[PDB]
């Protein structure tokens, strides 16, 4: 059946227990699964000057944004696939399913 | 147009450009008694160019006048046959 859950949040601790609750609820339903592949975290960096005007000492400033992205691959008949994704949706954590 | 340097020239000796009979046996007769042979010594004692020095150095090493130590580029180091 080959469905795949992908998680792409920025909050790591929300993301993990989402991912843990996928894999643990899998194991009551006893499904074979590729355990979470953790892709390299990608840092979005924006380096701006502090001052609004152009006076003073040239102090710069780097704002960054870390994005964490995991995927879990599952094979399951339809009733578990309807059950797993319907629950365990946590705010700020993005979930999307692809099949095959 | 003041310059705040002095800028003297030099003497600019005229080192030989093509090789002829007077240079040819002169290198033939006195590359022995040279303990160390290289391009720059040949420039200073024989007044030939680096061109001639590099080509003559290649010439002697097959036929037999000078023994090599090191055949790296830009630096040739040669000893005498005693």
């Amino acid at each position: 059946i080959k469905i795949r859950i992908t998680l792409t949040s920025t909050k790591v601790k929300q993301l993990e227990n989402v991912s843990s609750n996928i894999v643990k609820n899998a194991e009551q339903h006893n499904l074979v699964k590729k355990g979470p592949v953790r892709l390299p975290t990608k840092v979005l960096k924006i380096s701006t000057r502090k001052t609004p005007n152009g006076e003073g000492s040239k102090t710069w400033e780097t704002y960054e944004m870390r994005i964490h992205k995991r995927y879990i691959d599952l094979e399951a008949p339809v009733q578990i696939v309807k059950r797993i994704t319907q629950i365990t949706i946590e705010p700020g954590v993005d979930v999307e399913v692809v099949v095959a | 147009k003041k310059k705040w340097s002095k800028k003297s020239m030099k003497d600019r000796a005229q080192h030989a450009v093509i090789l002829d009979q007077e240079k040819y046996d002169r290198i033939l007769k006195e590359v022995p008694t040279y303990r160390y042979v290289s391009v720059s010594v040949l420039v200073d004692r024989l007044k030939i160019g680096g061109s001639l020095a590099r080509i003559a150095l290649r010439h002697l090493e097959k036929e037999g006048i000078i023994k090599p130590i090191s055949k790296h580029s830009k630096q040739a180091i040669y000893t005498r046959a005693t």
């Binding site: - | 450009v17 093509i18 090789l19 002829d20 009979q21 080509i55 290649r58």
Partner: protein, 145 residues
């Protein structure tokens, strides 16, 4: 390996294109003394003349250097690809030239005279002696004259 006795025909000076070309250097770098020929072009002519480029300028045969100068003064007729020439697709004649020695200086003055004669912007900038390629002049070239 190859040591060679040079002989009494040798020349410390030679004259091609009305310029006193010095001897005692390689032929391609020696002919760059002649205006209108630079290192690239000089290599191609001596290549197209089938001369040994390793030779010095003062020892080359009399027929070879006159063969060389013909290829310089009629370049594209002897299979030079003619985007290689300096004054190609000329403004009156339409045909690809290659000015040599005095032509380079004389023809450079002439096309200046057109821009001065039509009062084109670049010509008026040359008449004042200022820059013509759009440079800043507020600081640089300050003591030009």
């Amino acid at each position: 390996s190859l040591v060679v006795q040079e002989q009494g025909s040798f020349q410390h000076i030679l004259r091609l294109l009305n310029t006193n070309v010095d001897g005692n250097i390689k032929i391609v770098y020696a002919l760059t003394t002649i205006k209108g020929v630079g290192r690239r072009y000089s290599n191609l002519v001596c290549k197209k003349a089938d001369v040994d480029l390793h030779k010095r300028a003062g020892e080359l045969t009399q027929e070879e250097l006159e063969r060389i100068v013909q290829i310089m003064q009629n370049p594209t007729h002897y299979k030079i690809p003619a985007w290689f020439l300096n004054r190609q697709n000329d403004i009156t004649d339409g045909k690809d030239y290659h000015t040599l020695a005095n032509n380079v200086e004389s023809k450079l003055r002439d096309d200046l005279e057109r821009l001065k004669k039509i009062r084109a912007h670049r010509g008026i900038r040359h008449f004042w002696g200022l820059r013509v390629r759009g440079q800043h002049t507020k600081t640089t070239g300050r003591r030009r004259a």
